[PDB]
Scaffold this motif. Structure first.
Motif, mmCIF file in Angstrom:
data_model
loop_
_atom_site.group_PDB
_atom_site.id
_atom_site.type_symbol
_atom_site.label_atom_id
_atom_site.label_comp_id
_atom_site.label_asym_id
_atom_site.label_seq_id
_atom_site.Cartn_x
_atom_site.Cartn_y
_atom_site.Cartn_z
ATOM 1 N N UNK A 173 -30.722 9.174 43.255
ATOM 2 C CA UNK A 173 -30.024 8.128 43.994
ATOM 3 C C UNK A 173 -30.112 6.759 43.315
ATOM 4 N N UNK A 174 -31.198 6.503 42.590
ATOM 5 C CA UNK A 174 -31.268 5.345 41.696
ATOM 6 C C UNK A 174 -30.054 5.356 40.751
ATOM 7 N N UNK A 175 -29.943 6.404 39.927
ATOM 8 C CA UNK A 175 -28.831 6.513 38.974
ATOM 9 C C UNK A 175 -27.499 6.473 39.709
ATOM 10 N N UNK A 176 -27.370 7.302 40.738
ATOM 11 C CA UNK A 176 -26.181 7.267 41.592
ATOM 12 C C UNK A 176 -25.701 5.831 41.810
ATOM 13 N N UNK A 177 -26.518 5.019 42.477
ATOM 14 C CA UNK A 177 -26.169 3.634 42.800
ATOM 15 C C UNK A 177 -25.974 2.741 41.571
ATOM 16 N N UNK A 178 -26.776 2.965 40.537
ATOM 17 C CA UNK A 178 -26.670 2.181 39.319
ATOM 18 C C UNK A 178 -25.290 2.285 38.694
ATOM 19 N N UNK A 179 -24.685 3.467 38.777
ATOM 20 C CA UNK A 179 -23.342 3.683 38.226
ATOM 21 C C UNK A 179 -22.273 3.072 39.111
ATOM 22 N N UNK A 180 -22.480 3.162 40.422
ATOM 23 C CA UNK A 180 -21.516 2.627 41.379
ATOM 24 C C UNK A 180 -21.298 1.133 41.176
ATOM 25 N N UNK A 181 -22.399 0.388 41.046
ATOM 26 C CA UNK A 181 -22.350 -1.057 40.839
ATOM 27 C C UNK A 181 -21.431 -1.396 39.685
ATOM 28 N N UNK A 182 -21.701 -0.776 38.539
ATOM 29 C CA UNK A 182 -20.924 -1.025 37.332
ATOM 30 C C UNK A 182 -19.481 -0.615 37.541
ATOM 31 N N UNK A 183 -19.291 0.534 38.183
ATOM 32 C CA UNK A 183 -17.961 1.053 38.412
ATOM 33 C C UNK A 183 -17.262 0.356 39.582
ATOM 34 N N UNK A 184 -17.987 0.129 40.681
ATOM 35 C CA UNK A 184 -17.391 -0.541 41.840
ATOM 36 C C UNK A 184 -17.159 -1.994 41.491
ATOM 37 N N UNK A 185 -18.223 -2.784 41.608
ATOM 38 C CA UNK A 185 -18.159 -4.210 41.342
ATOM 39 C C UNK A 185 -17.739 -4.471 39.898
ATOM 40 N N UNK A 186 -16.587 -5.119 39.750
ATOM 41 C CA UNK A 186 -16.052 -5.497 38.448
ATOM 42 C C UNK A 186 -16.817 -6.676 37.850
ATOM 43 N N UNK A 187 -16.882 -7.780 38.589
ATOM 44 C CA UNK A 187 -17.562 -8.974 38.105
ATOM 45 C C UNK A 187 -19.006 -8.663 37.694
ATOM 46 N N UNK A 188 -19.514 -7.507 38.119
ATOM 47 C CA UNK A 188 -20.886 -7.103 37.796
ATOM 48 C C UNK A 188 -21.040 -6.595 36.366
ATOM 49 N N UNK A 189 -20.203 -5.634 35.991
ATOM 50 C CA UNK A 189 -20.195 -5.117 34.632
ATOM 51 C C UNK A 189 -19.876 -6.279 33.699
ATOM 52 N N UNK A 190 -18.867 -7.056 34.084
ATOM 53 C CA UNK A 190 -18.403 -8.205 33.311
ATOM 54 C C UNK A 190 -19.539 -9.187 33.005
#
Ligand SMILES: Nc1nc2c(ncn2[C@@H]2O[C@H](COP(=O)(O)OP(=O)(O)OP(O)(O)=S)[C@@H](O)[C@H]2O)c(=O)[nH]1
Ligand SMILES: Nc1nc2c(ncn2[C@@H]2O[C@H](COP(=O)(O)OP(=O)(O)OP(O)(O)=S)[C@@H](O)[C@H]2O)c(=O)[nH]1
Lengths: 243, 243
Positions: A173-190
């Motif tokens: 679930x750590x990894x699960x959520x870690x990928x979501x952030x990058x994939x969901x939130x755009x300004x986050x990966x950016x």
């Protein structure tokens, strides 16, 4: 009605997802299966179309071909039945609510050979689902890589392509959520692409940074053939694409 | 000094270009060859590094693996010698003016497996040359596809990637020039992407239309292993990248 095409690197789970998503849909729908992989051993579904009945990798390899030579050669040979396989698929499309298309083990066989490209070009608005092993996902730009690869498949095949991770059941679930952030939130990966002084990373920031251009949607799907995670989202995206 | 990496779909001519460009450079330079292809039969060059000495596709296939399974499995096994092969390459780099790296038959083996990705990540500023068969080149967006694929390889491997056509000797001068226009003149392809009412084409116009973003350079190379066309341009691009 509805043609969904599974596309992904060898190992990613195209075949597994074809069978399992098919069974999922066979509760409420008429479903047909299409195997376009010449070098595959066993299928967890029963195909109406199996290109192995015409040629197979290993059979061609008993002519002195190297593996990467017999693959390529197998799709050269399939062109002899181009129109036949196309019309068969167009016929399945009239007889079923879903035609699920399982592709060559290597996606470059599909993306770079005339067979796959021309098949896709003469099909009615097929939906491509491009699936990735989360294991490919290390640095920030991996995430940008996934989304741009889908765009490229989209460019190359002229079909809407949905980016997806498969095997999400293997993820903590750590990894699960870690990928979501990058994939969901755009300004986050950016943001994480910003603090990249190196050559590549800036190259990726300036890329994906378009946000306006790219295209609002292309939310990423999380699928699992094991738990059937994500299937309802896929099912949903597919009728929505058919609309 | 100078590590050049040939990358391309099976059949495109990576191996042929490695051998022939090597001979070209062996008039004025110290050149080393590196074969990273596990499933290859015969090489037109003499490698200092041959990963076939450790594992090969067909050998793994005599364990019950399908072709696309033994390929993938071969690169899983190469990870046992990750650090060894890396240091060998770094050593060749100190002993020669050029190290030419010939890659797996399928570029997705290189682009999606940890072996190739991590090798490239720990190498000193390697130059990737991404080569395409002109035969892939039909519609306007094919041209956009080529240039974006290079960008993606670039993203994925974190190395400058030069887009190239190979086998240009097979082209008639009509075709020759027809590709140059699209590849040379930007506003030209862009024009032909404009008169595209369809879904994909607009999608590609709005893409490549950035021109400002993308990046001025990435002029496309025209190579031929048969006539040695383009070699001086490559040679030039490589010292320029080393600068
Ligand atoms: N845990 C888990 N494993 C999966 C999932 N999907 C596929 N796998 C496993 O991954 C491996 C590769 O699956 P597969 O369906 O063959 O991939 P593919 O190569 O892309 O498809 P094909 O070439 O056989 S047609 C198989 O062992 C399969 O059981 C999943 O959702 N979760
Ligand atoms: N006419 C012409 N043919 C070429 C040229 N380069 C390669 N070829 C031919 O194309 C075929 C594929 O070449 P090859 O070098 O094996 O490609 P590759 O698959 O990308 O490389 P590898 O996997 O063997 S390492 C061979 O028959 C080769 O002789 C070229 O520049 N001009």
């Amino acid at each position: 009605s509805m043609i969904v095409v599974f596309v992904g690197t060898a190992g990613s789970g195209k075949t597994t997802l074809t069978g399992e998503f098919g069974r999922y849909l066979e509760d409420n729908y008429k479903v047909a299966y299409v195997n376009l992989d010449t070098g595959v051993k066993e299928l967890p579904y029963e195909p109406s179309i199996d290109v192995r009945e015409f040629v197979t990798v290993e059979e061609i390899m008993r002519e002195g071909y190297g593996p990467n030579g017999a693959i390529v050669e197998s799709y050269d040979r399939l062109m002899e039945k181009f129109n036949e396989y196309l019309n068969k698929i167009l016929r399945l499309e009239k007889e079923n609510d879903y035609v699920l298309i399982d592709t060559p083990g290597q996606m470059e066989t599909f993306l770079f050979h005339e067979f796959g490209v021309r098949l896709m070009e003469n099909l009615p608005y097929p939906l491509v689902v491009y699936i990735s092993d989360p294991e490919i996902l290390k640095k920030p730009n991996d995430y940008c890589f996934v989304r741009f690869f889908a765009l490229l498949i989209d460019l190359r095949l002229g079909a809407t392509t949905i980016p997806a991770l498969n095997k999400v059941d293997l993820l903590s679930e750590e990894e699960k959520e870690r990928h979501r952030k990058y994939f969901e939130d755009i300004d986050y990966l950016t943001a994480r692409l910003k603090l990249d002084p190196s050559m590549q990373g800036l190259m990726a920031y300036k890329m994906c940074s378009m946000m306006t251009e790219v295209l609002p949607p292309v939310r990423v799907l999380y699928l699992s053939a094991k738990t059937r995670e994500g299937f309802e989202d896929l099912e949903t995206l597919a009728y929505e694409h058919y609309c």
